C-alpha cells in the first residue's frame, strides 16, 4: 500500500460511508431487511444510514453537501472531531445539523444560525409545479477532522434525514458498511447479497480516485514483473 492509497483510506474513506447495502428500488425498510440479515464478507461493522446529496443555502451563500443521517446514539468516525457540540443533540424532530467546519465557513454560519437544506433528487408534484424537498435546519455546531470531508459532509438525525428524502415512514437509505479492506470494494461488491438489495460504495463519490489508484497499481506490478523477468 503506497502513500496515495494510505491517504485515501485513512483520511477520506475512513470518514465517509465506504459502502451501503440499499434497496434495489427506492429506500429500505428495516423490517424487511434488518441489520441481522446483513452478514457479508469483508465487513466488520454495520449501521443504519440515510444519506443524499443536498443543496445548502444560508443567509449569505449556497453550497453543496452530503447529508449523513445517523443514529446519534452510536459512534461515527466523525464523532471524535465535533467541536463543542454533542452528537446526541441531533434529536429526531429537531432538524439540527452539525456541519463540517469548512462547509460552515463557506456558508458563513455557526451555532445558532439556520440553513435551508434541499434534496434535488426528492420532489413533490403539485398543480403549481414540482417542488423539491427542503427544510430549514438549525446549525448546532461543527466537526473538524482535518480532511476534505470538512468541506462537504454534515451530520443530522437519521429520521430527519429520511423525512427530507421523502422516504416512507421508518425507511432508511440502507445499511452502512465498514470494511476491513475498503480498497477492495471491487471484489466485495460481487458477493451474494440479500434479495432485492444492492451494493453501492465509495466509487460512486470518487470513481476518478479508484481508477487513478488502480492505474498506478497495475503500472507498478507490470514494471516490477518486467524488472524481475529480465
Amino acid at each position: 500500500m503506497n502513500g496515495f492509497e494510505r491517504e485515501l483510506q485513512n483520511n477520506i474513506l475512513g470518514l465517509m460511508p465506504q459502502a451501503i447495502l440499499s434497496s434495489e428500488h427506492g429506500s429500505l425498510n428495516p423490517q424487511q431487511l434488518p441489520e441481522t440479515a446483513v452478514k457479508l464478507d469483508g465487513v466488520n461493522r454495520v449501521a443504519p444510514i440515510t444519506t443524499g446529496d443536498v443543496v445548502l443555502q444560508s443567509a449569505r451563500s449556497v453550497a453543496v453537501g452530503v447529508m449523513l443521517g445517523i443514529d446519534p446514539a452510536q459512534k461515527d468516525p466523525l464523532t471524535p472531531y465535533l467541536v463543542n457540540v454533542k452528537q446526541t443533540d441531533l434529536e429526531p424532530g429537531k432538524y439540527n445539523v452539525i456541519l463540517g467546519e469548512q462547509l460552515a465557513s463557506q456558508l458563513g454560519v455557526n451555532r445558532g444560525d439556520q440553513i435551508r437544506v434541499m434534496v434535488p433528487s426528492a420532489s413533490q408534484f403539485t398543480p403549481m409545479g414540482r417542488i423539491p424537498s427542503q427544510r430549514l435546519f438549525n446549525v448546532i455546531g461543527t466537526f473538524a477532522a482535518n480532511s476534505e470531508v470538512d468541506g462537504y459532509e454534515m451530520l443530522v438525525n437519521i429520521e430527519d434525514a429520511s423525512r427530507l428524502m421523502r422516504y416512507p415512514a421508518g425507511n432508511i437509505t440502507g445499511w452502512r458498511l465498514w470494511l476491513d479492506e475498503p480498497l477492495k470494494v471491487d471484489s466485495l461488491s460481487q458477493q451474494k447479497l440479500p434479495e432485492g438489495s444492492k451494493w453501492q460504495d465509495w466509487r460512486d463519490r470518487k470513481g476518478e480516485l479508484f481508477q487513478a489508484v488502480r492505474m498506478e497499481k497495475n503500472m507498478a506490478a507490470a514494471l516490477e514483473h518486467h524488472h524481475h523477468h529480465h
Partner: protein
Amino acid sequence: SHMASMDAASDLKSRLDKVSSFHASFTQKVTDGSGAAVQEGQGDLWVKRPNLFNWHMTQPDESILVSDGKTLWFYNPFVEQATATWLKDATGNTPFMLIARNQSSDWQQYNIKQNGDDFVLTPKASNGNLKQFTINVGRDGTIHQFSAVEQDDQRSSYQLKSQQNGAVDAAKFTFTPPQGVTVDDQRK
C-alpha cells in the same frame, strides 16, 4: 383555422367567467413517460378567481398549498414546516394558474380546440415545458377535469367532483400553521 381557436378561446373564457369561486374534491394522478404512476392523491380544492386558492391533499400524505393573493404557503406536515414564497415567483403558466386567472390574454397564448366540453390547448410557441393541456369545462363553467403533458412526457391529471360554485370563506385563503410548525419565510 385561426377562427376556430378564437371561437374556442372566447367560449372557454365565457364559460369560466360564470364561476367566480368554487369548492371541489379532486383526484390527482401523475405518471412518467413510461405510463407508470409516480404520484397519486386526493383531497379538496377551493378557488376564488383570479388568484386565491387552497389545494389540500389529504391522502395518501397531507400537504397544503394556499395562496392569499400575494403569498403562496406550502405546508409539508411530514417535516413540520411551512414555506412562504411570493405567488408571482411560482410557475405562472401551469394549467391550474390559467384556470384560476381566466384571462383572455393568457388564452391568446394557446391554440385551442373544443371537442364537446373538452378544450385542448397547445402553446403557440414553446420554451415553457408544457406540450399540451386539456380542460373539461361545462356550459355552466364548472371544471370537471384538467390534464397536462409536460415536455419530458410526464403526464398529470386532476379530476374534480362535488363542485359547489358560490362563495367560499376568506379563511380558506389564509394559512395558519398548526402548533409546533415552523415557517421558512423565503419572501424577498
